[model samples]
Target chain A: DPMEKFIKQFSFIALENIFRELPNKITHSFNDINDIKPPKLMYPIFYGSYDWHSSVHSHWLLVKILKDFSHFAPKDEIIKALDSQFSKEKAEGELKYLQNPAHKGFERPYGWGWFLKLTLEINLLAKENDKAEIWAKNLEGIADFFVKEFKEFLPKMDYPIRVGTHFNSSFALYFALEYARFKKDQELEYCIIQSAKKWFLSDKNMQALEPCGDEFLSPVLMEAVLLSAVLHKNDFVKFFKAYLPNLEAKEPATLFTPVSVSDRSDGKIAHLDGLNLSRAWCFKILSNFCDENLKILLRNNATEHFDKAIAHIEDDYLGSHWLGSFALLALDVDIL
Target chain B: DPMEKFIKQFSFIALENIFRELPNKITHSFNDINDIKPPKLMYPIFYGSYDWHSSVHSHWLLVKILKDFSHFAPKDEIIKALDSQFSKEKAEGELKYLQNPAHKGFERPYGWGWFLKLTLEINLLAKENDKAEIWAKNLEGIADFFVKEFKEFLPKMDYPIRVGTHFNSSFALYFALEYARFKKDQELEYCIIQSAKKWFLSDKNMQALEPCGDEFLSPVLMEAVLLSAVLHKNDFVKFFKAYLPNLEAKEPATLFTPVSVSDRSDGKIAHLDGLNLSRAWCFKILSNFCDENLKILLRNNATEHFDKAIAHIEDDYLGSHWLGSFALLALDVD
Candidate 1:
């Protein structure tokens, strides 16, 4: 029932913006934007996409489609995307440098809204089909890829896995949990969940949270808080909700604040000139599940972000706007 | 004066409680308690005498010794310890399996206190020897070792470098910084620092400051805050400090909490009892810098922690309580 509501409320236009716009703007060619490239999967496809988002909108769009439009995504295309997205062997090349304990890295493993969306969608599909078996395998493969890469990148350093922008290990745990949920493997599920729980509650992290400039933190906050609340972690939920008051500076429902694009110190969030796509999605996520006060914050701030933000984009081609626009659609303000 | 005060404030017996009493009780010489073949280097050194203090304390000790007691530690021994402690090559071999991302990864790079202590020690050592050509070689060696090792070990997916607790990639910037500082290399350093800076600053880690239990959150938060602060990030500092108040659950100056043990939900910290040496070090770290309201917390609560925490300990011979008392003749209490 709730899922159906989710589907019905989804915005198709924004979907076009992400799936269509992004490839057109960034790619050398866009004959089939979603088409998997041939041969060795040339030109940085394997990891750059994961390392970091090109823009705040780009990441936001990716998260939107993966989280919201997943059911509508063509199955063949989805499978192909997954196949292309996670090539263990190809990923190995990237990991060789990144998995090091000290390579000084970047990837949206945890922050990329699309990543979680992908996990959830895959889980939903598996739940629906009872055939998907690669949950743990995918996560492990990805984690494996990162580990070796980190090693070379950070051979003697001990800080590599502890704190960074991405927090990929934490995401790896989430992915593992998703796999566990679909596979009905409680052991794996508990292990991953417990790790996340420990990371959340332990005084292990050097700080209370990761930094804000990371594009993915907002969406992660939404997901983490929702999970905590559902799982009955009142403290976690409270900690997450505290970020909302700081929402005034950001695009209402978005989290894709690109460091290069906007003047972060300048408070022009309502203008949406360069608000991050990921941030938009974060706002959307918060709005979808928020209580009264948060819901009002979503409407007054985030809900209108979609159309208002789009006023600057004059191109009908929807080229680079794919991730950005999809983020707007994720906000889908009608309910608000 | 501050450094001296710090050294004197805590019990010199602090090291004794850990390196001596507890270790002698809990340490098993591989399998047998009595067969002390000086503990083989073959065993998982990470699991051996090195881990009790965990990386934080070990690293802290290295820097503190340089900062405070530079006159005592043998230069060769220090180099040997650095070699043994920081062999980029160790990320290889039989324990190579440690780098596998799938393993229940131990805290290595993510442990900021450890890395910072090491880095600052290296930096301070470099500073002290700024005019010496011989020391320059050693300094350069630290950087060279890091860069060469990084390029070499980058491809392994073994557990040592993988994701768990925190993924291996998070510390990339630190590695680059280390290399750059000593090598005087700027390109890779700039690139890596920028990459790590951008990725870390993303909004993704906002809620990552999760609570582990009643008094803890993931260790990531501590690292993040410290890293951000070191990088001169004021906002994150403000953000992190806000969350910490709840955990310390008191005012900063008057705060006191027992940090020497990890407590489980059963009101017991250090759930593994004697085996949880890592947890004990964490408690000590919390006691040292944080819980500044030390009147009741560390002063009273910490002193009582030993009662319920020693079941897993099996041996204590070379430990401080035994060996050091005899060696030092006189022990200093803070």
Candidate 2:
């Protein structure tokens, strides 16, 4: 199948970035003057793919492809790289950075969200593969850490941030809740739903003027998609009627129109490529409810957004590090 | 000189309803159900114009018209009515209804807001007329009561309400701030300004999907108008640009379009008339900042909305009770 060749090509893309260390971006509060923590020492576990979250998701991309398309993937090399990356010592070193008080909200729900997905991906793989169980067990402490932190900070968020960035609360909540589902962590799932309701239930007649020039996520669609997963079918459809009442008319027509990249070289603008990719993901997820007539519209839009944007993800290093992960998500790989 | 006819006509609208008792709308928490406070007793000060807030604003319409257009009005009847209505005992009896804990939020910022404007009107006229000072002094305790209640509520209101009703918080703040400015109550003006920034400053690229059937205020435009008054000229221009970025293109075409009323007799549907009138008012307030090319557009729109709906205030009792108050506001009568 095409996914066979597709998996082999995309699998190699993540492998190269999976263990690279030099071009890493790291930050923290300095103690005196030169107390800057080096990326090598701080991010010994996740020190590649340009940034912390990117590298972490890069690991997820590899494991996801390996699990789904291993018959076509370079399973040996992928296993070796993950074995080196997911080692117990490296995971312990990663905890040192995550435990730092000064960098509390740094990676936050975004980093922790991706980390939760990464752990769920490995934990799911461990059901068949013998080596994957070591990796799953090795990362359980870090998994426990993020779960604790996510639960602690959720109550304090009074209103949801509707930005299309690392701070997009819906995007993080969707992934966090999905991870809870596969792991069968019911209390964590309940807490996720509780926080989702508190932040989002008051939202009505959402008038989205979105795709802020540098944004990667469609803050509007992501919110609906997350709520679609949380609320029942009839409940979410009613919400759809109220939240984007003019969707049939397309009043906030910005959501219907796809954005263009001025230059893919500029990473912020490369986010437009990721933007189209994520819309495809959101459209596909939300179509489950009705798929009546709006279904034809969203699927066509989803197909157009995916086909137009999926090829360019491997075009630039800025997007390549992260875009393949979204492209894979856009292609409907596990919905994790 | 069109205001000459407007002042004469609008003065009569408020005069006929200022003291009418039957067909009055009144309610309170009743003890053992039969201990009901009668409309004349509970609203001894504001017992006409259908509802309490409507009656209060009717009083404001009479005073505002009488202040700005004495030449066009029957001064003796207007003055005598005011003399009879602004008594200390009536003000005290109004306080009896106002002070009842069961009816705490009965009129709130809406009733209190028009009442504040009424106090400002009488206080302004007191500067020249000797009889008006007694009216201003008689209502001072109720004004003090509302001011105290407003201060208490402002801190607890975490986010500003944006619905186009009596609960429309910005509308209340605008009149309250104007009242404070006219009375030279610097502290109240400061508190009102403090609350305005909190409810508004975070708002960006407001995508309006409004005129929710019966809503009278343009929640989006009302917010900008309130901010325009509070912020400096340059600050307001920049704030307006961010708040409604696509006003130039009018992406939210709902706000630009004037809605039609299916029935004027239905009170809620009659509110669509109030809707256009308030939009005209908001457009006028905001146009004070930058009349660039956008200026011509808003003025024409204001003129269109005001003229199209101004004639129908006396069409039916459903609207007549309060529609003149909005028509007077939209007509630039005061």
Candidate 3:
């Protein structure tokens, strides 16, 4: 059923990473970059335009690119680029230059920019690149920024932190560790591991309503859940499964964000956040974790979320980033 | 990793009950009492509180209080209280007495005052020597009143009857059990147990989001969840948890409060009715036995909540009528 298709489609992310050629080192737009062999360390803009198509699921495509080219690029070139680009010194300089041109110190931008950059970078570098030095330097840049800046910027301790907005940050911590494995950066790896360990609990806790928590069950949150669990952190995996209590309903999907249970009782769902397939980051995770039966549930229920992105594919080619990442994820999952 | 510790600890409620010394029981001042031992049979409130607490990583010390005095309790005390308190004469008198002198019969006070008195007495005595029988009695009394009154009240629900304060007499059928158990009054238990089940999950196509289903997730809602789960009822439990995701936080311990998670990120935890241990009473069954591990996580978190409650505990206990009951729960939970 859906579970079989889900598991099958789930593996495509890694398979693409292993087989796809890396983008050329030169920076280029999607149009120019199509067949250029996306780099072993492909760079999607850190703080650029927002294409509903390319925004959320870029990490999966980035991962596929990294895995395929890790053999050719090695780690040093990748490490140097990250250090130069994401470096605290670089980020600070960039932030400073942007915020106040006259006073040139690093300027820290808020919202999803840092997450977009770090996750995109880590996914690009995590593939089979087995170099100790390169891996260490790359992971160090991400961990340093996260430990130093991301925490201050996000500070998860605050209540109802309008979490739907920081969707990218959820997956970044997980991807950072996948990079650490080949680099052998234990310290940076440890933090990633530690954060990964807490991610599901944190996500679920964030969703809990009193006596119950909030119910912001975005598909992205689900992806984070499956990824965290399959990677050996089972807590998050189980935490996400709790949300399944709501998935059993037999109805054609609508884009309700599932804000609270009252709406569920009244049979009405709300789009507390905007509607887009960027939300499908989570569907990819579920497709990977579940069996044939459950996979059917994912496809039947979750696909409605991806219809818009599939419709928006430019020139009707499934190779575009939106279609590329999602199609690949769906391709990997069971067809039930 | 912290995740493993969280997962492993997530499975079971950590139970500890500490017995109270006589002089200590009277004062009901547990600030100085430490290290209370729990009972063999984990109480419903403890289990319920623990389960809810685990889901959100909250803890309460009051569970510790219940466990400590559970043994000294002669199970019959609760039965005795229920028999005497819910007797038809008492129910009629209490309901009558609640009416205003000038406005007789206009409002039947529902005489919840006796409910308060009974809960406090049973709780106070349990603390003195750790006997919980009285608590059971109070619960039985509540069931008895509802058994007799439910038929009378059920008809009034058609038009939404408003008494001095709360409305809908149909709610009292569900409300009576808030004090304790349904083991004694089968008829009252059956009618309530059945009505709550039918109403909570009334198929969306037919009838749904009724007054009970759409209302805020307060102690009243938790009470419904508890009754449905314990009685082995259907739909009630599911529908109860369904509303759980929507209730907004109105307390500092927002995670443990079980409110609806709304789009309103600006919402703050308000209302102390479900705060402290009173809220825990609302979730006794689902906390411990069902999904036991999650239950423990909730209880441990409740222990922490109890610590927080200590900071806010006032002379009147600030929220509920029974200060001693909470004091006992706070003192005994492990």
Candidate 4:
């Protein structure tokens, strides 16, 4: 119950973070000499949630809150906020930026993933309410570009990059999978699944031992998670064991234990907070295969990881811009 | 097993891709008006594998092959090849590129994640042989930059991106998580775990209506997999059910079935192969939690999806470049 309250409280913070990006951290890629574009020029609809991906997910979070938990009380405000932001002109600007060859790889797989996710959310909302339909139609151009990009790029990727950050292949695949399933894009679905296997199927002995200073993902665990999407039950069990042989023994103590962050003030150091939350996510899933005792340990570990870092999300700007989203992720586990 | 043999064959492809990049696809960002740098200048250590992320992982594949299956053939050749590319001077070039303010996000979470992975592999190798030591030590500066970058960027990030491509937040986190664990960097570990929960905990109603035309990932399933790493068993079961509530009835027919790809030649269309493979992956995992009957159904679906696309991985250049890796994924399932 308290978790729900915290999430509800943070919903405002999440919305604020998305809308509060005049002083943004801009990681841009340009082609033309005059391409000194600000966030608003390049990403009118997604120029605020700190960066493109964050803003995109922030939109998803707002919409999700509006869709499932309207009773929690941010309904009217969310509706108004989205209506203002999701105007046809703004959507067109966002679409145009994506259409540019000079900025083909802008925000790339990460931003593309979030954009599609946000699109899917809006599309779902549109079906339920008339107002949401206009926004969905307006955003289709940008969404279509990403769809094409995924198809185009998947073929050339000789191997999948297994990392714990922006280019992490598994994470990108996860979002793409959602979009494809929603759109019934059979071609996209086939390409992602096939390519994922080529990139990751043979991976063995994860040796997890990660979170390498700035990571927010459980690399080995995520791989297993990705495989969990494609492999059959019996096959997945075996493959998982091979990839992470020590799961039963907890041989890699690093996985079960919570990581300690020394300097939350430094933005990179703050990634450890995300690491804990994501780790909680994987462990919770892995617990399903564990014995009762191990299950309890895993669950408690999830809570331990979540409890320690959840409160500090809004304390600093470095953490505040995106931590609310992660906090929401942790809280969302219990919403159902 | 034949699986090992298949991987061995693909090793050549992975290696060749990394080294083959003169006629490259260059995507750059510059601050100065006259800045027209080549890929080599922008990414000295990672300019070979078509793109930065590809180059980074190509290095990983090589090192992994060298470390584990040296007998499968030539250890000395790999050693020499690695030494040539991983020189002290080359590393410094990489470090300099990363240190530039304008290039701060170079390769970002994806390439950065792979760079760390390569470091981890080389670091592991260095523990045994003197040759590997030099490469690992040389790459340290670049590695430290990423360490610093992660420390810097993680706190600033408020949400994680779920996509089927390069910038997906989960993919980057996976590698960083490994690097932190290997280095025994408790601080980074705490930071990642904590932040992950804040971003991913409260997900619900996973309809899994996914794999858009260009997607290479299963976002909803990937998130579930990430959560499986952290949540409790009983809790996970409940959460998963709530997340994918129609599994028993198969209400979302799209999820249980395999998708068909019409054109592998079109780069975007080729992603369908990956979609099928990854779908099998999540379904397989989901099956583990189901009862016998549902489990059988889920398993059959996984096989169906994997089988349809596995044969086409090498049918064309569009699929050949990376489909082998996915093929390995499907074959690896055994």
State the lDDT of candidate 1 residue by residue for A1-336, as single tens digits: 443433332333333332331211111112122222221232233322211233323333333445556565443444444455444565454344344332222342332333433444545545544323354245344444433332332222211123222343443344445544654656545544554454444332222232232222332443453344334445544555553444444433233222232322211111123233333444555555556776666555544544444433333222223333444444453463
Model 3, B1-334: lDDT tens per residue? Answer: 4223322221122221111111110000011112111211212221122111111111112222233333333324333433443344543443332231321222121333223333444444455543344443434444345345454443322112111112222334443454334234455455555654444333221111111111222334344443454355444445444444333232223445433312111111222322344334433434543345556655665555444544332222112122233433334333
Using Cα atoms with residue i matched to residue i, what is each candidate's TM-score against the true structure?
0.40, 0.53, 0.32, 0.54
| Model 2 agreement with the true structure over B1-334: per-residue lDDT tens digits | 7777777777777887777654544433322222344566668878777668888888888887777778888878999988999999999999877886645555766898988988988888888789989999999999988888787677655445566766678888888888888877888888888988976787897867466545678878888888888888899899988887776675567767776766675445678888888888887767667547777677777888787678887887557778778877876622
Give interface RMSD (Å), model 2: 28.0
- C-alpha lDDT of all candidate models, in order: 0.36, 0.76, 0.34, 0.71
Docking quality (DockQ) for each candidate: 0.02, 0.02, 0.01, 0.03
Highest DockQ against the true fold, candidate: 4
Best by lDDT: 2
lDDT score of residue B197 within candidate 3: 47
lDDT by residue (A1-336, candidate 3, tens digit) is: 433333233333323332323211121112121222222223232321122113224433434334543333323443443444444453453333233322211222212333334344454444434432343344354345544543333332122221222233344444444444544656656554454444334443232111111122343353354345435535544654653434445221232232221221110011221223434445555645555666566654456655544433332211232344544444344332
**Interface C-alpha RMSD, model 3:** 29.0
Worst 10 residues of 3 chain A by lDDT: A264-273
Query: CA shift at A112, candidate 1, in angstroms?
Result: 13
Where does candidate 1 stray beyond 4 Å? A1-165, A168-211, A219-225, A228-279, A286-296, A304-336, B1-72, B77-133, B136-334
Error of 3 at B152 (Å): 52
Model 2, A1-336: lDDT tens digits are 867766866787788777665444443332222223445566887777867888889999988887877898899999988888888899998887677653455576678889998988988789889999999999998988998877776654533556576657788888899888887889888888987776676678886655654578887788888898888889898887888777666567777777777667654467888889899888888766654777767777788888878778788677788888888888862321
List where candidate 3 sits over 4 angstroms from the true fold.
A1-47, A50-143, A150-162, A167-169, A177-220, A223-227, A230-241, A246-276, A300-304, A313-336, B1-334
* Error of model 1, residue B283, in angstroms: 11
